[PDB]
């Protein structure tokens, strides 16, 4: 069953790659890679990517979870093939993740690109929701994924995605990044990305940083600077933020404990109620200054809407198998709050159950883990799109084969 | 840490050595139990359980029944020469007795 084959999970924020049957991916690296139009030259390993550079683009090839910059996408896959896997693509079958809403043209273009450029022996293009379901040991369930760009609820029933049940919201890691930008600005925080500091000294809580700036810095462009600052912001999201266990209450949030934090330059302070107010916008976007509008659905409402758009006969299965994924779901009390609100708003006629995965690898790379398990079954070795399927049927085979 | 192995498993028993030793640790049967007493006690306990379950099931089959009733226990523990001795002063609820009719009280 398990053959030398490569599993790719290409997320909007990071890409995971590895072999079939591993517990964890062989490598994970930022999808928002660096570029200079020299043809162009690319940087992906975080050691060359965080160098302040004479020119920069920070190109980010994917739009709304789908490939748009095929050149940078090809460069990413090239670098992955010969920097971390270090194997000839013609030897190993390729299993690759895609967004459930990806269009047919993209599927066909990826198929022909894979077979012509990488000369691979076989191919299988699979949607993140089904992979996440396989990773969590179920054939049926509601897959909730709160990623960087969008938070999406996708029903999987008997191994297949229900397009009519997909619900998507822009409330996601990038929206949290914007909220962090706004909060830092309102706190007048001097956010400095790590590359700029030569040395620093300790300072008191709330006092400005005492640091020296490097003298050899070139005139870096705005996009790469934004990327680096957003990396610091997402570290802050890991470090400080926490969802309110229930509906945000200013009085309660004032009673809640602070969390101490420091920015790379040395500026440091305690964060209080604000660190709970930011994630509340994920669950109730009405109290989000600057983003007024009732069209936005929060995480719990994304879930309930997604299940409600399905047949009532399969809603019991979907609510009884809520599978939760995506990096944002690592925020403290995120799953507890989600479980509470869904317990409140799920109809009494049906059982509610959330699958109990909690690890960073689990929550984020469920799609890659799904590829790992899926590529390790005999019943799956007959589902491959072989190079012969492509040579005979052409680029369209991916539409006739696996959904 | 290491995958935890039980004490019934390492020895190779079905009766709970943990639970057996446990009744002993807080049973005041002694003052400082060692590291073989519960194993031996559980092994022999369950050995006698098997010894009897055997005779009980065999008599049950003699009655063309697939479920051991307390009768399949009275009949057994009185049918075996040493189980009867061991359980001589033990009454088995809803078991009955064995049809031992005295020879002199028969038709002549």
């Amino acid at each position: 069953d398990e053959v030398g084959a490569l599993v790719f999970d290409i997320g909007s924020y990071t890409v995971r790659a590895g072999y079939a049957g591993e517990d964890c991916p062989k490598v994970d690296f930022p999808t928002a890679i660096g570029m200079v139009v020299e043809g162009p030259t690319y940087y992906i390993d975080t050691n060359a990517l965080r160098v302040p550079r004479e020119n920069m683009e920070a190109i980010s090839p994917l739009k709304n979870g789908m490939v748009e910059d095929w050149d940078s996408f090809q460069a990413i896959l090239d670098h992955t093939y010969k920097m971390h896997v270090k194997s000839e693509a013609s030897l190993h079958p390729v299993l690759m993740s895609e967004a459930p809403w990806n269009t047919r043209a993209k599927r066909e273009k990826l198929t022909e690109l894979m077979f012509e450029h990488y000369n691979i022996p076989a191919f299988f293009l699979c949607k993140t929701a089904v992979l996440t379901a396989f990773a969590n040991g179920r054939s049926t369930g509601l897959i909730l994924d709160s990623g960087a760009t969008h938070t999406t609820a996708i029903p999987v029933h008997d191994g297949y995605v229900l397009q009519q049940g997909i619900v998507k919201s822009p409330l996601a890691g990038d929206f949290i990044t914007m909220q962090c930008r706004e909060l830092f600005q309102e706190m007048n925080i001097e956010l400095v990305p790590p590359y700029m500091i030569a040395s620093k000294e300790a300072v008191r809580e709330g006092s400005p940083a005492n640091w020296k700036r490097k003298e050899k810095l070139p005139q870096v462009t705005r996009s790469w600077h934004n990327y680096m600052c957003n990396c610091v912001i997402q570290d802050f999201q890991a470090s400080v933020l926490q969802v309110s266990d229930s509906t945000y209450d200013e009085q309660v949030a004032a009673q809640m404990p602070t969390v101490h934090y420091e920015f790379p330059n040395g500026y440091n302070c305690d964060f209080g109620a604000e660190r709970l107010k930011i994630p509340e916008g994920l669950f109730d976007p009405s109290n989000v200054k600057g983003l007024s509008g009732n069209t936005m659905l929060g995480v719990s409402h994304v879930v309930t809407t997604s299940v409600g758009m399905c047949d009532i006969d399969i809603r019991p299965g979907l609510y009884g198998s809520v599978i939760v994924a995506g990096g944002n779901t690592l925020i403290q009390s995120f799953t507890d709050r989600l479980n509470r609100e869904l317990s409140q708003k799920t109809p009494p006629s049906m059982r509610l159950k959330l699958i109990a995965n909690n690890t960073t690898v689990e929550r984020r790379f469920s799609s890659w883990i799904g590829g790992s398990i899926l590529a390790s079954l005999g019943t799956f070795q007959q589902m491959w799109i072989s190079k012969q399927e492509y040579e005979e049927g052409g680029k369209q085979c991916v539409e006739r084969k696996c959904p | 840490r290491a995958k935890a192995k039980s004490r019934s498993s390492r020895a190779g028993l079905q009766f709970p050595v943990g639970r057996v030793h446990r009744l002993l640790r807080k049973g005041n049967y002694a003052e400082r139990v060692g590291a073989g007493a519960p194993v031996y006690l559980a092994a022999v306990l369950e050995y006698l359980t098997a010894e009897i379950l055997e005779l009980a099931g065999n008599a049950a089959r003699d009655n063309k029944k697939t479920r051991i009733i307390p009768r399949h226990l009275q009949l057994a523990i009185r049918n075996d020469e040493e189980l009867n001795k061991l359980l001589g002063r033990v009454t088995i609820a809803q078991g009955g007795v064995l049809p031992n009719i005295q020879a002199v009280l028969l038709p002549k």
Binding site: - | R10, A11, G12, L13, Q14, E51, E54, N58, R61
Partner: protein
């Protein structure tokens, strides 16, 4: 890892209590009827109309030959070859140490219930 059978400890023959004499007959009888048995691995109607047919005149029951003059031959029952030996417990016959081993593990005492 472990020898992985002390948990089930099936036979544990400290109390073996051999089956013998009439029990052997039962086994023999069982085997006979099994060789006389049918698809499943009306017979009651056959026995009923046969017990209607009981009489001393020439009929089904009185048409049985009987015991043979030529005495019974031994055969192994594991491979069917001529068998110098008998199993001390159940009385079934065999021809090697290996055959006794297989018989003790699968057919001796196990199917007498």
């Amino acid at each position: 890892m472990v020898e992985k059978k002390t948990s089930v400890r099936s036979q544990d023959p400290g109390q073996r209590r051999v089956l013998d004499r009439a029990a052997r007959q039962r086994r023999i009888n069982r085997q006979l009827e099994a060789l006389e048995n049918d698809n499943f691995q009306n017979f009651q109607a056959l026995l009923e109309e046969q017990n209607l047919s009981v009489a001393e005149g020439p009929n089904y029951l009185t048409a049985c030959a009987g015991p043979p003059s030529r005495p019974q031959r031994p055969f192994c029952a594991v491979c069917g070859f001529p068998s110098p030996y008998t199993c001390v417990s159940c009385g079934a016959r065999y021809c090697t140490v290996r055959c006794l081993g297989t018989h003790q593990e699968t057919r001796c005492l196990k199917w007498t219930v």
